[PDB]
Each structure stands twice: as structure tokens, then as C-alpha cells.
């Protein structure tokens, strides 16, 4: 649709899937994650979108690794969404990948200053 993650708009399905299958075969202890700013977010940008993440990384650990790349100030709030839902704090990144990776074998996560996606 017209509301679609930007990475999927710029790379077609079969090309994405081929890279997802290859990187999962080459680095089976990590999971490929596409990280993008939510559309209506008022927040700093990330240098890159494509991350290889240890499966055993906690969600809270992942939050901090992205926060320090955005260079947020202490008073700046940060929220993450998988299919419009904030992940449970008890999840690992491998768990989110296993539950929610798309058919191209990427896991998509969005970040925002707001607590509701695209508010």
C-alpha cells in the first residue's frame, strides 16, 4: 500500500529475500533487522538501516544501542514498534525475529519519539 516501509519501497521482494536467505546462512547466530524512523516521528535520523543483531540480545540492550546512534538527549523519549506494537521487554531480538520476520527473512522495526506509531 501507500503506507509501506521505505526499504520495501526501494528494494523488490525477490531481491530482498535472496539477501535475507544469504545473510541468515552466513551468520546464523545473528538476525538481520531493518530499522527505520516512523513516518510522523520528530526525532533524529540513523546513519544506516541494516543491522545484524545477536539473537541473544535483549530488547532493552537493543534499545540502548540504537539510542546512542541517534544521539538522543536524556530528556528525549524513544519507542520501538514491530507491526505497530511495542515489543515486550522480556523478548530477545532472536525471539522477535523468529516470531515476526517477513517472507524476505528480514525483521522490520520502527522507532519514534511517540508511544503510538505514526501519531
Amino acid at each position: 500500500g501507500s503506507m509501506k516501509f521505505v526499504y520495501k519501497e526501494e528494494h523488490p521482494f525477490e531481491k530482498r529475500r535472496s539477501e535475507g536467505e544469504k545473510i541468515r546462512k552466513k551468520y546464523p547466530d545473528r538476525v538481520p533487522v531493518i530499522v527505520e524512523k516512523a513516518p510522523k516521528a520528530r526525532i533524529g535520523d540513523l546513519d544506516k538501516k541494516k543491522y545484524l543483531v545477536p539473537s541473544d540480545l535483549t530488547v532493552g540492550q537493543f534499545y540502548f544501542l540504537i539510542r546512542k546512534r541517534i544521539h538522543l538527549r536524556a530528556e528525549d523519549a524513544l519507542f520501538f514498534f514491530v507491526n505497530n506494537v511495542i515489543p515486550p521487554t522480556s523478548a530477545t531480538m532472536g525471539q522477535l525475529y523468529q516470531e515476526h520476520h517477513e517472507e524476505d527473512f528480514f525483521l522490520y522495526i520502527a522507532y519514534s519519539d511517540e508511544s503510538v506509531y505514526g501519531l
Partner: peptide, 12 residues
């Protein structure tokens, strides 16, 4: 060589 477009994350 397959990772020129991928950044690897880690925790100490």
C-alpha cells in the same frame, strides 16, 4: 565481504 552494507551490533 557480504557485509559492506550491514552494521554488526554487539553488547560488551
Amino acid at each position: 565481504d557480504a557485509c559492506y552494507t550491514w552494521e554488526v551490533l554487539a553488547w560488551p
